Design an enzyme around this catalytic site. Structure first.
Site, PDB file in Angstrom:
ATOM      1  N   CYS A 119       0.809  -1.211   0.000  1.00 42.06           N
ATOM      2  CA  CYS A 119       0.000   0.000   0.000  1.00 42.06           C
ATOM      3  C   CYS A 119       0.853   1.278   0.000  1.00 42.06           C
ATOM      4  O   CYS A 119       0.685   2.161  -0.858  1.00 42.06           O
ATOM      5  CB  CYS A 119      -0.967  -0.015   1.160  1.00 42.06           C
ATOM      6  SG  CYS A 119      -0.335  -0.376   2.788  1.00 42.06           S
ATOM      7  N   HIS A 168      -3.349   0.795   6.460  1.00 42.09           N
ATOM      8  CA  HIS A 168      -3.502   0.796   4.987  1.00 42.09           C
ATOM      9  C   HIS A 168      -3.524   2.260   4.544  1.00 42.09           C
ATOM     10  O   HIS A 168      -3.896   3.157   5.308  1.00 42.09           O
ATOM     11  CB  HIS A 168      -4.762   0.080   4.585  1.00 42.09           C
ATOM     12  CG  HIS A 168      -4.938  -0.205   3.140  1.00 42.09           C
ATOM     13  ND1 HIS A 168      -3.996  -0.928   2.431  1.00 42.09           N
ATOM     14  CD2 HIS A 168      -5.963   0.078   2.317  1.00 42.09           C
ATOM     15  CE1 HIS A 168      -4.454  -1.030   1.182  1.00 42.09           C
ATOM     16  NE2 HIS A 168      -5.650  -0.475   1.075  1.00 42.09           N
ATOM     17  N   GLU A 180      -5.339   1.497  -4.927  1.00 37.61           N
ATOM     18  CA  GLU A 180      -4.665   0.818  -3.806  1.00 37.61           C
ATOM     19  C   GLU A 180      -3.944  -0.419  -4.258  1.00 37.61           C
ATOM     20  O   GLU A 180      -4.271  -1.069  -5.247  1.00 37.61           O
ATOM     21  CB  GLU A 180      -5.702   0.409  -2.724  1.00 37.61           C
ATOM     22  CG  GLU A 180      -6.720  -0.605  -3.211  1.00 37.61           C
ATOM     23  CD  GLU A 180      -7.698  -1.029  -2.103  1.00 37.61           C
ATOM     24  OE1 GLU A 180      -7.482  -0.707  -0.927  1.00 37.61           O
ATOM     25  OE2 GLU A 180      -8.707  -1.706  -2.456  1.00 37.61           O
TER      26      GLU A 180
END
Length: 208
Positions: A119, A168, A180
């Protein structure tokens, strides 16, 4: 309810310092993410017609400041370049700990045999194109840039999840979508924004 329950409920990979990003064994060179980022930042400033002898190429604003190196009149262009860079990676595999300023890379621990992005690696790669230098850890990324209320997130702002933004991180695309590197087995993707576990602020690295 502290975490996004669709993803492992743990802090994301935390890769220290300024990792080597490029290794060329034939030429016998190597360079770090910060080197590549500075080089790309100077190129970007040159393309705007504004490079100065004092520019290292690193364009980050002091954390919390609304004034960074890139002029506001060029920030949309900068942001769109960052987004294009990230979106060009759709389909690249996820790898825990993977990615640097130069592109996808071997990960760590679990991700050791997989070249890809995690991420924070995807985010750092994307922003490096305009000289915005980010650490390879989502929680450390959350402490940089300028906070914007989540309810006012804008295309190009950076969305965080979990305590300290540690779980994240993604790039908001506008229209309820985000870019993402999600989880093992998956690829870099565009997905609907998720609110579970989201921090109450997004981060803006580029003003416009």
């Amino acid at each position: 309810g502290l975490w996004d329950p669709t993803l492992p409920m743990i802090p994301s990979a935390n890769i220290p310092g300024d990792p080597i990003a490029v290794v060329n064994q034939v030429l016998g060179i190597s360079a770090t993410s910060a080197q590549v980022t500075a080089n790309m930042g100077r190129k970007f400033l040159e393309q705007l017609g504004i490079l100065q002898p004092t520019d290292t190429g690193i364009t980050n604003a002091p954390a919390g400041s609304a004034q960074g190196r890139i002029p506001r009149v060029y920030g949309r262009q900068a942001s769109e370049y960052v987004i294009r860079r990230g979106m060009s990676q759709i389909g690249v595999p996820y790898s825990w700990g993977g990615g640097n300023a130069a592109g996808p890379s071997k990960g760590i621990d679990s991700g050791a045999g997989t070249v890809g992005f995690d991420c924070s690696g995807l985010v750092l790669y994307s922003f490096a194109g305009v000289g915005i230098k980010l650490p390879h850890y989502s929680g450390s990324q959350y402490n940089l840039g300028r906070k914007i209320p989540s309810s006012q997130m804008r295309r190009g702002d950076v969305i965080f999840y979990g305590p300290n933004g540690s779980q994240h991180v993604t790039i908001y695309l506008g229209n309820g979508q985000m870019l993402e590197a999600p989880d093992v087995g998956l690829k870099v993707r565009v997905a609907p924004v998720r609110t579970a576990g989201m921090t109450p602020y997004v981060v803006r690295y580029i003003e416009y």
